[PDB]
Amino acid sequence: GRYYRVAFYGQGFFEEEEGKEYIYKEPKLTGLSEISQRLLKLYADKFGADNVKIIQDSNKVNPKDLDPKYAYIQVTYVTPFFEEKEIEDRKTDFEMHHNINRFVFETPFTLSGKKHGGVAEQCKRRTVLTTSHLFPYVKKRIQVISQSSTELNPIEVAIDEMSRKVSELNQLCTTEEVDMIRLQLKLQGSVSVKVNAGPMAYARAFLEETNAKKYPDNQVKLLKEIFRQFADACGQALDVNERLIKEDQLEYQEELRSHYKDMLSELSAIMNEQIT
Amino acid sequence: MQAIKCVVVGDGAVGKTCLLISYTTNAFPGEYIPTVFDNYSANVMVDGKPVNLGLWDTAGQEDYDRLRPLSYPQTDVFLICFSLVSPASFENVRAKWYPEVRHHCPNTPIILVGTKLDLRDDKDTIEKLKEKKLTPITYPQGLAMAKEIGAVKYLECSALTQRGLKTVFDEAIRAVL
């Protein structure tokens, strides 16, 4: 199913649930608005709709921020969390769905206090919540009894996002039957970004030699290598898309190849390596 | 798993990336994890069945007019987005987006989406719009536009409150299946 963190804060409202935090287990592909509205309704029936509020912020709640005139329900989507030692022993999807008591979500933050910033300023927390019992369970929810967190600095976020893009594009290219619409969606969103900052935004924030050195050389080293792999994985996905496209997507493909080649040119100048 | 290509179009700053990020990552807009990449996917349970929904997030500004249609081949359904508190984006549904889609895709189903529902009733938004002698787009006017441009659905939503958000992408899939 789908798992949600729900936490209750409402001194003159909740009883047993007050101060508590749970992982709710929802039906397959249930969305955030479907559980938020139900919870909102369910507790609006106990306390009155005017007195119940959702907390969208996923950072740990500080009760000093809450109006004592309202009960509050914090809701946040979480996913089953496994470390690399667990991910090897667990085999099937049924094994990722069974006997699980840890769950992860991510929070955006910057060291200025702002939640969101450009790539050179944007950090990310990973909070792992642990329940008192393993799922599946007789109950719909299980109390969270501990939490653990790590944070990523901007270049660690850059490393993390670029590394997963490599693995994604690599995976698409070696699946037996490739879903063309999925391949182009991630290909065009890699070599041809126009709304968001673009993968080159990481290269310019961290790999340029005309920036003030700010990050360990070993991390700058590793981000460079990942970018070399990214440029590789773009060219392979590009060529796979060559074989798949019909005549209606010749001009779109050639436009994707021209954006790819500009990207590799710009990367080449920043890294002082000729890239592909 | 059947993949569906849905292409989202509209003026800049009507909320499209926010909607798509919020929806596909299952997060409230305030907590979205920024991404340097474009476009999004999601697995939606529609009428009991799970389907893959590839969402193309296109740049609506004039400097992108000539290349954006290269994204239109193989589309199953379009979303033409405007903002309910931006009368100017609502007029560009008729002045620009409707003609562009049909000038390229004569028979692809269009869904007309009014975004930022929460701000139509917002006092500050009203008062700022009133300052320019404008006023939010009502539901009747959005429906009237939906009729003039032949969209199969008219939909209003708000990434912040999540109202009507599940429905937009359910209908995007139902217009294809």
Side-chain angles (χ1 to χ4, degrees):
Chain A
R2 272 223 179 126
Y3 295 96
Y4 286 94
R5 182 274 293 273
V6 180
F8 300 114
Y9 298 92
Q11 290 270 279
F13 295 94
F14 298 104
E15 299 298 315
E16 187 183 354
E17 297 169 313
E18 160 66 0
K20 292 204 172 56
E21 181 179 70
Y22 297 83
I23 303 312
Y24 277 64
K25 175 199 49 219
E26 291 289 313
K28 290 68 50 209
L29 296 186
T30 297
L32 170 69
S33 165
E34 315 177 82
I35 172 179
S36 320
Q37 275 310 315
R38 274 195 290 273
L39 298 179
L40 202 54
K41 163 264 159 201
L42 189 71
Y43 291 89
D45 273 321
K46 310 299 173 293
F47 310 143
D50 280 352
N51 305 320
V52 187
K53 282 181 177 346
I54 299 282
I55 287 177
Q56 297 179 13
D57 175 8
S58 65
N59 201 25
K60 180 165 167 63
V61 158
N62 187 336
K64 84 197 285 200
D65 291 332
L66 308 174
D67 196 328
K69 308 284 225 279
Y70 300 109
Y72 293 85
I73 314 171
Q74 182 185 41
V75 181
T76 305
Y77 173 57
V78 306
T79 58
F81 171 92
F82 306 104
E83 50 213 31
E84 297 78 350
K85 166 172 286 303
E86 295 190 275
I87 201 60
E88 67 208 16
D89 305 329
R90 304 188 178 274
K91 306 183 173 184
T92 56
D93 51 13
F94 163 91
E95 206 148 357
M96 177 262 293
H97 299 144
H98 217 285
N99 294 18
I100 72 180
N101 69 353
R102 302 205 292 161
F103 301 92
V104 66
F105 69 93
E106 305 199 322
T107 303
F109 81 88
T110 74
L111 289 178
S112 51
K114 297 176 92 312
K115 207 177 295 190
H116 282 119
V119 295
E121 64 185 298
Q122 178 74 70
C123 310
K124 177 210 284 191
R125 190 167 308 116
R126 290 175 59 80
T127 307
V128 170
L129 309 173
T130 295
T131 49
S132 65
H133 304 291
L134 293 157
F135 276 116
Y137 190 53
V138 49
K139 304 247 176 299
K140 270 164 28 65
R141 64 188 196 175
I142 311 179
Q143 170 164 211
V144 182
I145 55 94
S146 81
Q147 63 86 28
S148 75
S149 58
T150 55
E151 316 189 307
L152 290 196
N153 70 28
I155 204 189
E156 290 160 340
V157 171
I159 283 175
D160 166 63
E161 162 138 293
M162 294 307 305
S163 301
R164 287 179 294 96
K165 190 51 69 180
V166 169
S167 275
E168 190 163 2
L169 286 168
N170 281 344
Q171 190 263 351
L172 283 168
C173 290
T174 61
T175 56
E176 182 221 4
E177 256 270 296
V178 187
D179 185 308
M180 188 190 69
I181 288 311
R182 278 151 134 174
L183 171 75
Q184 297 167 345
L185 181 125
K186 313 289 180 191
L187 186 56
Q188 180 179 354
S190 296
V191 303
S192 192
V193 179
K194 295 163 191 345
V195 180
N196 289 329
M200 289 305 296
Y202 288 142
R204 286 192 304 274
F206 299 102
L207 298 182
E208 303 250 37
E209 290 205 6
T210 46
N211 290 329
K213 299 173 181 176
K214 188 190 265 162
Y215 289 96
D217 292 342
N218 63 328
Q219 287 180 310
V220 167
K221 185 153 191 226
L222 168 65
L223 184 53
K224 282 185 191 182
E225 167 66 12
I226 284 157
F227 256 100
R228 295 189 191 94
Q229 296 180 13
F230 172 75
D232 213 285
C234 286
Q236 209 213 328
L238 199 42
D239 294 343
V240 173
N241 196 46
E242 189 76 46
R243 194 185 79 251
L244 299 178
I245 53 164
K246 292 170 199 299
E247 185 282 335
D248 70 315
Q249 288 191 297
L250 295 179
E251 180 179 25
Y252 158 91
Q253 167 73 2
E254 283 309 310
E255 195 47 55
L256 292 177
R257 178 189 323 291
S258 142
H259 279 75
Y260 172 72
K261 286 191 172 172
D262 303 324
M263 175 180 97
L264 304 149
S265 181
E266 199 211 338
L267 194 53
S268 278
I270 302 170
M271 281 175 75
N272 299 287
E273 316 179 22
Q274 279 303 331
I275 298 296
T276 293
Chain B
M1 198 163 311
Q2 169 168 2
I4 295 183
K5 180 157 169 202
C6 171
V7 179
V8 183
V9 297
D11 293 356
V14 304
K16 297 183 301 287
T17 315
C18 191
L19 294 195
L20 295 172
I21 286 192
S22 164
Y23 180 73
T24 62
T25 72
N26 214 23
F28 294 109
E31 317 299 305
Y32 81 101
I33 312 299
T35 175
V36 301
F37 300 106
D38 277 351
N39 316 323
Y40 314 88
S41 71
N43 293 321
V44 190
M45 201 74 81
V46 177
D47 310 337
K49 330 179 197 68
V51 284
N52 190 242
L53 182 65
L55 294 158
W56 269 254
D57 183 29
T58 69
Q61 284 87 359
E62 176 183 349
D63 278 56
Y64 304 95
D65 287 7
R66 48 181 266 275
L67 274 205
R68 174 170 63 249
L70 298 185
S71 261
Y72 298 179
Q74 298 283 318
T75 302
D76 304 297
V77 59
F78 286 84
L79 302 191
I80 300 191
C81 293
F82 73 92
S83 173
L84 290 166
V85 304
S86 169
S89 69
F90 180 66
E91 169 68 42
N92 265 339
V93 175
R94 161 204 288 144
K96 181 190 190 164
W97 297 116
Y98 175 47
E100 169 164 324
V101 175
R102 287 294 172 232
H103 268 142
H104 280 286
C105 294
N107 316 92
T108 310
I110 287 185
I111 298 180
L112 180 62
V113 186
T115 73
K116 292 180 193 171
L117 180 67
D118 59 299
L119 299 165
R120 161 158 75 196
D121 37 293
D122 177 78
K123 148 215 164 195
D124 306 65
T125 315
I126 282 162
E127 292 176 340
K128 161 62 70 189
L129 270 168
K130 220 280 188 197
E131 152 191 354
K132 286 264 163 61
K133 309 316 171 312
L134 301 175
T135 173
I137 304 305
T138 68
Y139 184 97
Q141 299 163 338
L143 186 67
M145 179 71 63
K147 292 179 179 184
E148 175 194 334
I149 77 162
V152 303
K153 298 293 173 198
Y154 172 58
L155 293 173
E156 307 200 320
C157 69
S158 155
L160 180 47
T161 70
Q162 300 284 297
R163 290 166 332 217
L165 198 51
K166 182 191 172 50
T167 278
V168 157
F169 302 98
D170 285 354
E171 299 301 320
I173 296 162
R174 277 186 199 101
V176 189
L177 288 192

